[PDB]
Design a protein around this ligand. Structure first.
Ligand SMILES: C[C@@H]1CN(c2cc(-c3n[nH]c4ccc(OC5(C)CC5)cc34)ncn2)C[C@H](C)O1
Ligand SMILES: Nc1nc2c(ncn2[C@@H]2O[C@H](COP(=O)(O)OP(=O)(O)O)[C@@H](O)[C@H]2O)c(=O)[nH]1
Length: 858
């Protein structure tokens, strides 16, 4: 029905009559008596929900922060010993089925065996105390339906009750098991640090050690204060997890530092000149909570001051809204390095840093080097004299999330300048996370970054954005170019996702084209990091993205999502690339319905927009547009699917009816079958041994050859004629080569060896051959394997995973030559682009050239 929650410090269980290790539940009203110990605080922000009445026992506060974070409106009642209301002191059928849970551990994978209903019915039940289905994409545990929620609350913090605060996995195991270790980390209870050790941020040492960190003088350290009224519920578990997962990449961007933990604070040190002491502080006569950050006042010690500050500021934008103001940032400074530090508000010091980088009664570059961006590389600092920038509508390029890209020229080159409109330094520095520290041939390159006008200077895309290409010039979107656009964008996502960064808005407007030459090394780049954020391991919570270009789990802001939200965005981008304008053009002509169908009721691309069919990409779109984010392939797999020449050159995959078993076929665009008929345009369901009219193995290249029995005649399955003589017999895994001039065997070709090199499945029995003028030979093996071999050097690629046994191979004229192949599986009439042997080499060279470029930039 409706559930009640009793929250408060140690001083609850006794009050429940009308030592609490857990959130034990004794329903009458459904009570959720919490734990007052400070050790359990980090794990149960999650269990506070909207449909609950809150009771507080202060006895004779961080609790209300998350009370007014999951739901602003809540009937909070206070008793003794921001919605205060008292100071007295002292889907219905599934509920019955879910009540009975006769299992060992109360977890059920799916309700189908036990039993738009499910997904919504469970949420209402989840809002009650019947069961806990977290179903958040980040947690990756939506397949677990936790019945008897009192079990989950009880045995999930038993690790912290059974040096001071580190526990190994084996000790927990020595006390259906891998899911337990996932629950521990995903609730910020026991996060891994080593291969066999769990940190357990809670229940660490209560008091910090005695640290004699090398630099003690005022002129050798930089101190940053983060005064708060109180530490938000489970703040340090979030911060410690964030700081030990970025530690190897905090100076270089992989140097593992020496780390210390005391449950409020962390000490990272790479050297006596490169350390960082993030830790809580307690000032006398101050009822506040501080967060001191001490770093050395050197070049290598300023770099990771702006790293820690960026990772703490971001950690409150996505995880602790409300502190942003309750939280005020100070900056300790002292003129003579013998006196006591003095503090100035970081906002007040930002005003003095906008007009001259000096502070008068010492430079600002040592008080707070991150407001003047003095910690980012010295080569990306704006020289305002060499900037010819106008800010006129005639020079407007695009409108970014928070700025407006204008055209300008910097250092003589013609570049693009972004002006932040009303904004803060955080927006400039949040986008600076990706522009520097990450270099890739598929990410826009930053040339300079100013602070006085607060602009970014990116390189200029020669040919504009992809959105204009789709909507204006549709004639230049060749099939070999719009594949490279998707390949380059998928490579950009792969680097961003591998670098802890979720991009959030991937749309054609943010895809920049530097050339329309299909064979160039760099064609597409992704720009605009306005909403890119760190997705550390805990996912992201805040929801951003343009409607119609975002994942379904992003439109609904209640869940916390992960980097898989960009794969769905990529699936829509590749959906638009395949359909050119298509949905986007209709989207601007139908507002508030562009995101209505994303849901995800996207129609078939060929059926509606009438594009040229592209198999293995329509399949890729279908498996990227998955409602379940776990079913979507990762960005490292989307690139791997796109990085294949069989995907590019596969044109038609007509599927014949069941058990038709066609054995002969001839071309004419329509294809004949045998007697049947098939039209390529509408896909509507020996011939002209025979030759077109010799009647039988006949080929010519006017010299004509033939084959009968086990001998070759001129005036055994197939006869292939070239400068040499290629022929194979029935059930012959080897193809022999002959010479017309000598009438003698000149070597043999064995397909089994080629198949053996690639890691009775592999038939290898030759069933047909076909030759192409590009010194490449097509061999049809007994399985679903196709061998491409040079005619001169005598392997290109082995084509597989499209049928079960290739029957007949031939070349036809579609205005494009195609190598249409018929094979059994059910039988299918596969059609391949004749340039497949070339595209295997061109794409192989293209990846290697870009691979060298990626190492070159870093
Ligand atoms: C057609 C015209 C348009 N053009 C461009 C350039 C750009 C561009 N370049 N560099 C950028 C860096 C960032 C950037 O942030 C976006 C994606 C937020 C707009 C855009 C550009 N974006 C559109 N159009 C270049 C000229 C030659 O051609
Ligand atoms: N004298 C007195 N003691 C109380 C009162 N209410 C609770 N207590 C004491 O508080 C203890 C209950 O602790 P409790 O809040 O349940 O611990 P927690 O659930 O772990 O936070 C009992 O042992 C009582 O002795 C009261 O009104 N008067």
């Amino acid at each position: 029905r409706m559930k009640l929650m009793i929250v408060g410090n140690t001083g609850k269980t006794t009050l429940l009559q009308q030592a609490t290790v857990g959130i034990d539940v004794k329903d009458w009203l459904n009570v959720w008596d919490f734990a007052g110990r400070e050790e359990f605080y980090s794990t149960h922000p999650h269990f506070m929900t909207q449909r609950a009445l809150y009771l507080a026992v202060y006895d004779l506060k961080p609790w209300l922060f998350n009370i007014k974070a999951r739901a602003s409106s809540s009937p909070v009642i206070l008793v003794g010993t921001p919605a205060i209301r008292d100071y007295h002191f002292v889907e219905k059928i599934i509920l019955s089925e879910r009540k009975n849970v006769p299992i060992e551990f109360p977890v059920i994978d799916r309700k189908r065996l036990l039993q738009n209903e499910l997904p919504h019915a469970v949420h209402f039940l989840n809002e009650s105390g019947v069961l806990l289905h977290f179903q958040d994409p980040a947690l990756q545990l939506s397949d677990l339906y936790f019945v008897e929620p009192k079990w989950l609350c009880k045995i999930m913090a038993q690790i912290l009750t059974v040096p001071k605060g580190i526990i190994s996995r084996r000790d927990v195991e020595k006390f259906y098991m891998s899911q337990y270790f996932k629950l521990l980390e995903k609730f910020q209870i026991a996060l891994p640090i080593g291969e066999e050790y769990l940190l357990v941020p809670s229940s660490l040492s209560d008091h910090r050690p005695v640290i004699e960190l090398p630099h003690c003088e005022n002129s050798e350290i930089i101190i940053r204060l983060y005064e708060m009224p109180y530490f938000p519920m489970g703040f340090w578990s979030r911060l410690i997890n964030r700081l030990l997962e970025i530690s190897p990449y905090m100076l270089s961007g992989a140097l593992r530092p020496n780390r210390m933990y005391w449950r409020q604070g962390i000490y990272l040190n790479w050297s006596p000149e490169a350390y960082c002491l993030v830790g809580s502080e307690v000032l006398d006569n101050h009822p506040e909570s501080f967060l001191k950050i001490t770093v050395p006042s050197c070049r290598k010690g300023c770099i990771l001051l702006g790293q820690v500050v960026d990772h703490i500021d971001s950690l409150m934008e996505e995880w602790f809204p409300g502190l942003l103001t309750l939280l005020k940032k100070w900056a300790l400074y002292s003129f003579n390095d013998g006196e006591e530090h003095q503090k100035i508000l970081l906002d007040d010091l930002m005003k003095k840093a906008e007009e001259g980088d000096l502070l008068v009664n010492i430079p600002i570059s040592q008080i707070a080097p991150d407001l003047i961006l003095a910690d980012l590389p010295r080569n990306i600092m704006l020289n305002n004299d060499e900037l010819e920038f106008e800010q006129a509508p005639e020079f407007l390029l695009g409108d970014g999330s928070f700025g407006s890209v204008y055209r300008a020229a910097y250092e003589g080159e013609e570049v693009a300048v972004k002006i932040f409109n009303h904004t803060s330094l955080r927006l400039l520095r949040q986008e600076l996370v990706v522009l520097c520290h990450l270099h890739h041939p598929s990410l826009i390159s930053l040339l300079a970054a100013g602070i006085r006008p607060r602009m970014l200077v990116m390189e200029l895309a020669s040919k504009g954005s992809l959105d204009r290409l789709l909507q204006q010039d549709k004639a230049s979107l060749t099939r070999t170019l719009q594949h490279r656009i998707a390949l380059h964008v998928a490579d950009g996502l792969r680097y961003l996702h591998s670098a802890m960064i979720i991009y959030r808005d991937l749309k054609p407007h943010n895809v920049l084209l530097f050339t329309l030459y299909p064979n160039a090394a760099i064609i597409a780049k992704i720009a605009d990091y306005g909403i890119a954020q760190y997705c550390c391991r805990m996912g992201i919570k805040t929801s951003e993205g343009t409607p119609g270009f975002r994942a379904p789990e992003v439109a609904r802001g209640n869940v916390i999502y992960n980097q898989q939200a960009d794969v769905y965005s990529f699936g829509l981008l590749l959906y638009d690339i395949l359909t050119t304008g298509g949905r986007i053009v209709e989207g601007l002509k139908f507002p508030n319905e562009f995101d209505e169908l994303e849901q995800g009721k996207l129609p078939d691309p060929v059926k509606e927009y009438g594009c040229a069919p592209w198999p293995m990409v329509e399949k890729l779109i279908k498996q990227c547009l998955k409602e379940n984010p776990q079913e979507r392939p990762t960005s490292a797999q989307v690139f791997d699917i796109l990085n294949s020449a069989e995907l590019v050159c596969l044109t038609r995959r007509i599927l014949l009816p069941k058990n038709v078993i066609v054995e002969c076929m001839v071309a004419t665009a329509s294809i004949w079958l045998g007697l049947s008929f098939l039209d390529l345009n509408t896909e509507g369901y020996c011939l002209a041994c025979l030759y077109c009219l010799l009647v039988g193995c006949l080929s010519e290249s006017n010299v004509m050859w033939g084959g009968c029995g086990t001998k070759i005649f001129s005036f055994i399955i197939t006869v292939v004629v070239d400068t040499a003589l290629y022929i194979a017999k029935q059930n012959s895994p080897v193809v022999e080569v002959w010479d017309k001039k000598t009438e003698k065997l000149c070597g043999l070709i064995d397909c089994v060896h080629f198949l053996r090199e690639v890691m009775m499945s592999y038939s290898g029995r030759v069933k047909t051959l076909c030759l192409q003028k590009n010194t490449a030979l097509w061999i049809g093996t007994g399985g679903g394997h196709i061998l491409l071999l040079d005619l001169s050097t005598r392997l290109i690629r082995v084509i597989y995973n499209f049928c079960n046994s290739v029957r007949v191979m031939m070349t036809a004229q579609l205005l494009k030559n195609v190598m249409l192949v018929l094979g059994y599986n059910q039988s299918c009439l596969t059609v391949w682009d004749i340039n497949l042997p070339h595209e295997v080499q061109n794409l192989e060279k293209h990846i290697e050239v870009r691979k060298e470029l990626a190492e070159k930039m870093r």
